Amino acid sequence: HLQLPRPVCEAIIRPVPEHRADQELSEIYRDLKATFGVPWVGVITQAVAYYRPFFAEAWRRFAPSAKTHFFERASDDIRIRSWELMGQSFVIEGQTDRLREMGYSVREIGQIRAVLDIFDYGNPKYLIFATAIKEGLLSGRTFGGAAGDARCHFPRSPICQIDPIPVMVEEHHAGGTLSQVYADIKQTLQLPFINSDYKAMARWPSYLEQAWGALKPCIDTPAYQAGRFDINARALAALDALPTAYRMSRDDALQAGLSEAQTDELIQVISLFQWMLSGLVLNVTHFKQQAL
Amino acid sequence: PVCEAIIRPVPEHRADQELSEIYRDLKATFGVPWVGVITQAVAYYRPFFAEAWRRFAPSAKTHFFERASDDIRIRSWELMGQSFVIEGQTDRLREMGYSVREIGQIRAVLDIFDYGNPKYLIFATAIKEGLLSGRTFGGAAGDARCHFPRSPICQIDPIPVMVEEHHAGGTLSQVYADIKQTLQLPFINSDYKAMARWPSYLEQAWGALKPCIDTPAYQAGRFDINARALAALDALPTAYRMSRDDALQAGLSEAQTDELIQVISLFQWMLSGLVLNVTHFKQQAL
Amino acid sequence: LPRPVCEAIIRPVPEHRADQELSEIYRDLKATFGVPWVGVITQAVAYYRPFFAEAWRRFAPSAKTHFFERASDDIRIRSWELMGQSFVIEGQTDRLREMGYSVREIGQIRAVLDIFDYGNPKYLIFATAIKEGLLSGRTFGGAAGDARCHFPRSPICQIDPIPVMVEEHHAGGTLSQVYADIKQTLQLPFINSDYKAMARWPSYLEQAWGALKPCIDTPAYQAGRFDINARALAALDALPTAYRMSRDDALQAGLSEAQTDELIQVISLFQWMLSGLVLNVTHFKQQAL
Amino acid sequence: LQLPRPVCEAIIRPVPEHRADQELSEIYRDLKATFGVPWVGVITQAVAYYRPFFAEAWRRFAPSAKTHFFERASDDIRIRSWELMGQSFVIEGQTDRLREMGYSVREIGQIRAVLDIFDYGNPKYLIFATAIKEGLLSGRTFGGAAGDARCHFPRSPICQIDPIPVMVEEHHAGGTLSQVYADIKQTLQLPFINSDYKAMARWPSYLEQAWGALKPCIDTPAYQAGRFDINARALAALDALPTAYRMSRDDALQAGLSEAQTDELIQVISLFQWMLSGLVLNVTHFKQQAL
């Protein structure tokens, strides 16, 4: 009552960060960001990018859907649901005064909020794409492409920007005690990597400490796990309603250039990220509500 | 629409630092990179404009307002889809020397005004109808999610490159003169000035839209879009009142209020056509 | 300083068309010069991509130096001097505000002029290096001299964004007539970045050009132009890192001999203009405050 | 074997760009446009606390800072520092070290680009701090002394102005960063953390590496000899300003400052003026490691 199970993953995650991405991969990354209308490339997508012929082909097959009005709406309703869920389930104290007291100015606190907005907007879109990748491999099915409201096929609300990449304190940038927030987060969220979200927050170390410290107790409360299940279900639902059909099976993966062992590995990797992203959506919603 | 009043818009490149602060809050809230000529003109009646924005902002910050603006964009895209067959111009433009990247730069520009103009239409409606009627618009608790914060990403920098009328040269003044004639306006909108950064492109897009202007299908769409704007006003999440009397406590004279009313009425009428005109452009480009 | 004969077609590759291979060179040229546009000079030479890449590889080490910064800066200074004395130049800040321009608009205009005032001497010296290298076969520079000449140049610079330029296919009816006038008056087959960047404000360009035009090819002008050219040739004789790039070097780079002969004609056209363009911009900028 | 001595102290109250109201932001913006730099110095933040002095000293110094002379005189302080540190120190590259720590080539370039900013701008702040301090201490009028007309020409005009460098402020800092900051403060003998080190702190592991390599050189005789030389260049520049500068105690009083305020400012500008010679040397060192 009522919990989302963490998939087994013993495969090594090998994300290709934007600052290491070669010219070819950089072009794909850029088209993703333009399509999603986000200034960063998700770690989810960095890790998938390792298996590059798969990534390119699964991107090419999913992009016609991510361009649509439906995707914008369906992602946005996931942001709404998280706001709704966390509000009702939690007493979230504002932290603005506490930050002001630690010496943060008004300009700075708005800067912090702007960074929270980036991830509040983008993560839903990454959740659905990860659901498409993971379920397309596991099931071999084709998803969406149904007739429906023509308006679902219209251009999504045009926004921006690709630029710049948010300032993120990477793990090799860290940091000493910052590595230990990083380790705590890792232990607590049960992950082997630190999310883009927390690395952006890490440009203000004392702020991350504060925000993460107030979120931690909520993690894996019954209301948290229940809400996480709901977030995930809504991503499954979005998958079945894509305006342009999506299929990317094991055989598609093999035809794209992957070995059997590679495809097995990918399946674990995408599975952990897809699981992860339900929580990440909730976590950012909390951060944003603290900062009102 | 009846108007004899002089329109006295304050450009962002002239705005003083007190007004520039309002402008900036308008831009962050709407999530757009330009201050519309609508609001430029209303800023002249500065006391009213700061009070009106005070009262409208809490609605504009909401989920409701975001969807309601987006649904106007959707509707316009629908209407111009049906009522007009509109040929791509992507090939003509490459024939003229424009490269792929340049054509994407043009699109990115249209996207701005395609996203924003609905937000300025709803605000213009709220100003006009509030003055004319003294009614309090909106305020219902209804669905809670309507009061949630809007989709947060946007971009407010840079100000788009606009070729102002005093920048303009010989023939560009003629394209401007035609546009002011055809559209019955005494000013050139941001949109066309922004397009005029590529003058040959503007000539080509204007000439393709110009025949559509006062056709019965256009007038009908323009009525439809206007209706939706009126409907959005009726459903603002935070109440909005700003009457003739309210304008006084803001610091306007009755005579200035009467001038104000004529000014907004012209702009509010204008924004309907602007939303359509832009849709058309965007459809021309792929 | 007579215009050279150029019957060859100029085929510049603009930044919005450059493939990712060329674009990477372009970005290195920009970071090195510390400027935010790639010169048409560079665009035209890049058509001969094999040569262009080798020539930049060889010219880059001098361009990174304190010497090169100083020697480019000293040309800007000299041009400022010459136009100060040889011409009576009229403040026009007042007509502009009269024409409708706000003070921040006039400021944006100055910032644009500043870019070309800074950068063009660097392009002049480069074009001179390419030209004399092909014509003479000689190795230029390489002396140890004063060690401080080989130190890194003054680091600060802006390379984003690309200036807004109204290209010849962007242009409307009248704007093609201004461009026509300029290409005629200056004896050029193309429109320089500079004027295209001023063209962002069409009425302003009409004015600034109208004021410069009666100075072109006056004896004082031609004399200054001779001086600016002479200073570029001297900058070449004093490069910190040796620069050789001969006709023979162009073959070994991957050009044919016919392509080389065409290149010589092209670069000679540009190298002759760049002295002219340096004074033109000085004039524009003295028109502002 | 020669040293520049540091003077004594009062309390420093810098007004950072993110707190600055909009009157002050307007002066800050003209400063940066005139210097051609993306950051307002802590030197000038601290002086901005005494706002009508700051406003007036800036108004008097700016005509000189616009000139070709200033640009050159600043640039030569940078060159001399590069010369100085080169000749006097066995300074090893740290690029292979960083890459081993996991830093990529794009990242190391980003770090250089940040080092470039302060290597350019600090000499200009040094000269201005020397003008503020000596003008108060002496009552004298500096420069204006009609020489080469080319000295009065506009300076080299391109400049990087509008992204303020990402700086990890003290109240941003978390734990071990505060102790690095403490080490720096204690070693450089300062009660504040320079913009430079805070910009470097966007990459904590890099700051620790770069700072740790520098720390041995600080107050070697070669360091101090060099620091004295940097300081002399700054005094020399002051006497050759093309537009005369005077800003005395009574200039300060007539601007709205009290006697006690003026005494305080004097101690504050003296500490910053002293600091800047060392900072010039410290950045030169960082930048040579990163070759």
Curated annotation (Swiss-Prot), chain B:
Pfam families xrefs: DehI (PF10778)
InterPro entries in alphabetical order: 2-haloacid_dehalogenase_DehI (IPR019714), AhpD-like (IPR029032)
Keywords: Hydrolase
Membrane spanning stretches: none
One Gene Ontology term of the molecular function aspect: (R)-2-haloacid dehalogenase activity
Enzyme Commission designation: 3.8.1.9
Enzyme class: hydrolase
Enzymatic reactions: an (R)-2-haloacid + H2O = a (2S)-2-hydroxycarboxylate + a halide anion + H(+)
Keyword Hydrolase: yes
Description of how the protein assembles with itself and partners: Homotetramer.
Family: Belongs to the HAD-like hydrolase superfamily. S-2-haloalkanoic acid dehalogenase family.
Function: Catalyzes the hydrolytic dehalogenation of small (R)-2-haloalkanoic acids to yield the corresponding (S)-2-hydroxyalkanoic acids.
Protein's name according to its UniProt entry: (R)-2-haloacid dehalogenase
Organism of origin: Pseudomonas putida (Arthrobacter siderocapsulatus)
